[PDB]
């Protein structure tokens, strides 16, 4: 029997909505953790956390393909996104998931942008995990979301849990609400400037790229992510989207307009993986745009880490598989072909079993949507890769 079956046998029974979320999310998270070879106690801990702090605040059951909100977590507005980080050296993958919790007050004057449940989750986790630090959490929360702060993307905050084989890490995401005088980039920049960083050199590099560079001026910052650790050890990830999709544009953004050098081998491998996962022709000119997709989340997406740990900011690119690839199976086989060609595909069949579990009954080879992004980071001569997965509760109602 699995961990979820044991816990579901013995834990107290839940009301209809909560029990639906338990019997849906429990098996998914447990299957992902099992295919990634997590220790049994970590699976038990993960599902126990899920049972106590996530499931009670997930809101009503899906009952149709119509989502109860326009949540920014996923395109069909599923409030959960899983992610599977590939580790080099035949190491085990890392599993994470992001959740936006909800309450009956969402949209009301008491909580018009659905922030209270995420805050409650962060504080409960702080009660259990003493290593969490809420200094930067509170700072960026007040500055971007609280009283006196300012069009919406559909959410303003969500949280993520990283099961890092032995301990739990928490990430927080702020989605600023834009006004004619306060853009998301404006709010994020002024909050980072008020955050008390030692150095702001990477922030100023990103600011100069976005303001002055011809490619950087095509990027629209929209989201900030932090780690709930000591602020000196946290990352500062600024996410930005562009209508541009050419790989020349992606490479220039990866280099921050040529600021980062000694990345040519990494970017060659990235070009290969990009064509493979999107299903492109191997001879596709890096100057060509991908065929137009007009969506709130189409275009190329990146995040810039401006953590004061370094003076040059680091860039991560997200290949938008759901918008540009032909189908999830083709995209997964492309990613796996790259991984096995570079000796990092020890968990390929496990990843595929996870996809088959998450995928709508008989849609892996006919549609996209399960895999939202393939995230790429340039680590010396190698790539760090992460798959992001959408359970598609509403786009695939069962
Ligand atoms: C909101 C979600 C699920 C992903 C945003 S990108 P990430 O923070 O998961 O990437 P890393 O944790 O830095 O590896
Ligand atoms: N769902 C939003 C926010 C998001 C961005 C990147 C992610 O990895 C996850 C979520 C988007 O696709 O733009």
Give the chain as a 3 state SS string.
CCHHHHHHHHCCCCCHHHHHHHHHHHHHHHHHHHHCCCCHHHHHHHHHHHHHHHHHHCCCCCCCCCCCCCCCCCCCCCCEEEEEEECCCCCCCEEEEEECCCCCCECCCCECCCCHHHHHHHHHHHHHCCCCCCHHHHHHHHHHHCCCCCCCCCCCEEEEEEECCCCEEEEEEECCCCECCECHHHHHHHHHHHCCCCCCHHHHHHHHHHHHCCCHHHCEEEEEEEECCCCCCCCEEEEEEECCCCHHHHHHHHHCCCCCCCCHHHHHHHHHHHHHHHCCCCCCCCCCCCCCCCCCCCCEEEEEECCCCCCCCEEEEEECHHHHCCCHHHHHHHHHHHHHHCCCCCCHHHHHHHHHHHCCCCCCCCCCCCEEEEEEEEECCEEEEEEEECCCCCCCCC
In a domain, 72, yes or no: no
Please work out, in degrees rounded to the nearest 5, the angle formed at the alpha carbon of residue 258 by the alpha carbons of 257 and 263: 125
Both 41 and 129 in one domain: the answer is: no
What is the CA(15)–ligand 1 centre distance, in A?
32
Ligand nearest to the CA of 316: 1
Closest CA to 96 of 85, 112, 111, 105: 85
In angstroms, the CA 199 to CA 122 distance is: 27
Distance from Cα 184 to the centre of ligand 1, integer Å: 19
Domain match, 266 and 147 both: yes
Tokens of 176: 């600023």
The answer to whether the annotation marks 338 as part of a ligand binding site is: no
> Checking DSSP bridges between strand 94-99 and strand 80-86, what pairing results, if any?
antiparallel
Q: Give domain status of residue 396, yes or no.
A: no
Same domain, 118 and 203: yes
CA distance 121 to 54: 8
Nearest CA to ligand 2 atom 10: 73
Q: Would you mind telling me the total number of residues written for the chain in this entry?
A: 398
Distances (CA, A) of 95 to 161, 165, 386: 9, 9, 10
Resolution of the experimental structure, in angstroms: 2.5
Give whole-number Cα distances, 60 to 12, 71, 101, 102, 221, in Å: 19, 14, 11, 9, 32
What is the Cα Rg of the chain in Å? 20
**Tally of structural domains, the chain:** 2
Cβ-based burial of 351 (10 A; exposed 0-12, middle 13-18, buried ≥19): buried
Q: How many CB atoms lie within 10 A of CB 311?
A: 11
Ligand 2 binding pocket includes 84 (Cβ within 6 Å): no
- Domain assignment of residue 194, yes or no: yes
Task: Note whether 112 and 215 are same-domain residues.
Answer: yes
Q: Is residue 114 part of a domain?
A: yes
The parent domain of residue 22 ranges over 1-61
Q: Is residue 130 part of a domain?
A: yes
Q: Which two tokens stand for residue 264?
A: 């040519």
Q: Point out which residues pair with 382 in neighbouring strands.
A: 379
Technique employed here was X-ray
**Residues 162 and 246 grouped into a single domain:** yes
For residues 40 and 89, state if they share a domain.
no
**Same domain membership, residue 145 and residue 9:** no
| 225 and 185 fall within a common domain | yes
52 annotated binding-site participant: no
Looking at the structure, tell me whether residues 87 and 48 fall in a common domain.
Answer: no
Question: Would you tell me the crossing angle of helices 264-278 and 328-341 to the nearest 10 degrees?
Answer: 150
d(CA 181, CA 145): 16
Same domain? 309 vs 165: yes
Q: Is 223 marked as a binding-site residue?
A: no
Q: Are residues 10 and 147 located together in one domain of the fold? A: no
Cα 193 vs. chain centroid, distance in angstroms? Answer: 24
- C-alpha–C-alpha distance, residues 389 and 373, integer Å: 8
47 and 90 co-located in one domain:
no
Residue from 171, 240, 373 whose mutation best tests the ligand 1 pocket (most atoms within 8 A of CB): 171
Q: Is residue 201 marked as binding?
A: no
Confirm whether 22 is domain-assigned: yes
Neighbours of 103 (CB within 10 A): 15
Residue 71 maps to a domain: no
Is the torsion defined by CA of 145, 136, 220, 71 positive or negative?
negative
Taken in order 277, 385, 93, 164, is the CA torsion positive or negative? Answer: negative
The answer to whether the beta carbons of residues 143 and 190 sit under 8 Å apart is yes
Contact in structure between 86 and 344 (CB atoms under 8 Å): yes
- How many Å lie between the centroid of ligand 1 and the Cα of residue 80? 13
Evaluate whether residue 197 is within a structural domain. yes
Residue labelled with tokens 């895999």: 371
């Amino acid at each position: 029997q699995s961990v979820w079956k044991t816990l579901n046998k013995w834990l107290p029974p839940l009301s209809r909505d909560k029990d639906w979320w338990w019997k849906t999310l429990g098996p998914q998270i447990n299957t992902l953790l099992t295919e990634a070879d997590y220790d049994l106690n970590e699976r038990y801990e993960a599902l126990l956390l899920l049972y106590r702090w996530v499931v009670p605040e997930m809101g009503p059951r899906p009952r149709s393909s119509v989502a109860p909100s326009k949540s920014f977590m996923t395109d069909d507005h599923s409030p959960i996104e899983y992610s599977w980080k590939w580790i080099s050296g035949n190491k085990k993958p890392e599993i994470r998931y992001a959740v936006e919790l909800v309450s009956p007050l969402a949209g009301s004057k008491q909580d018009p942008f659905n922030q209270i449940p995420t805050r409650n989750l962060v504080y409960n986790l702080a009660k259990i995990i003493p290593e969490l630090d809420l200094t930067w959490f509170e700072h960026f929360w007040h500055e971007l979301l609280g009283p006196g702060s300012p069009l919406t993307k559909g959410s303003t905050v969500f949280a993520a849990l990283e099961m890092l084989h032995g301990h739990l890490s928490v990430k927080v995401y702020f989605i600023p609400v834009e006004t004619p005088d306060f853009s998301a980039w404006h709010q994020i920049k002024h909050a980072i400037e008020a955050s008390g960083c030692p150095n702001l050199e990477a922030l100023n590099h990103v600011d100069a790229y976005l303001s002055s560079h011809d490619d950087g001026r095509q990027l629209r910052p929209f989201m900030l992510a932090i780690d709930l650790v000591e602020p000196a050890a946290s990352r500062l990830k600024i996410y930005a989207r562009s209508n541009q999709t050419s790989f020349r544009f992606v490479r220039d953004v990866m280099t921050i307009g040529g600021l980062r050098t000694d990345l040519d081998r990494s970017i060659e491998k990235f070009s290969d993986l990009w064509k493979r996962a999107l299903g492109l022709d191997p001879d596709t000119p890096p100057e060509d745009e991908l065929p137009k997709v007009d969506h709130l989340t189409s275009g190329a997406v990146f995040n810039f880490d401006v953590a004061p740990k370094s003076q040059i900011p680091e860039v991560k690119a997200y290949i938008p598989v759901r918008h540009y690839a032909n189908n999830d199976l083709q995209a997964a086989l492309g990613l796996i072909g790259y991984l096995e060609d570079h000796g990092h595909g020890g968990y390929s069949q496990s990843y595929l079993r996870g996809l088959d579990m998450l995928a709508p009954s008989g849609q892996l080879d006919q549609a996209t949507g399960v895999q939202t992004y393939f995230a790429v980071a340039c680590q010396g001569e190698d790539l760090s890769l992460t798959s992001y997965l959408n359970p598609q509760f509403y786009a695939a109602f069962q």
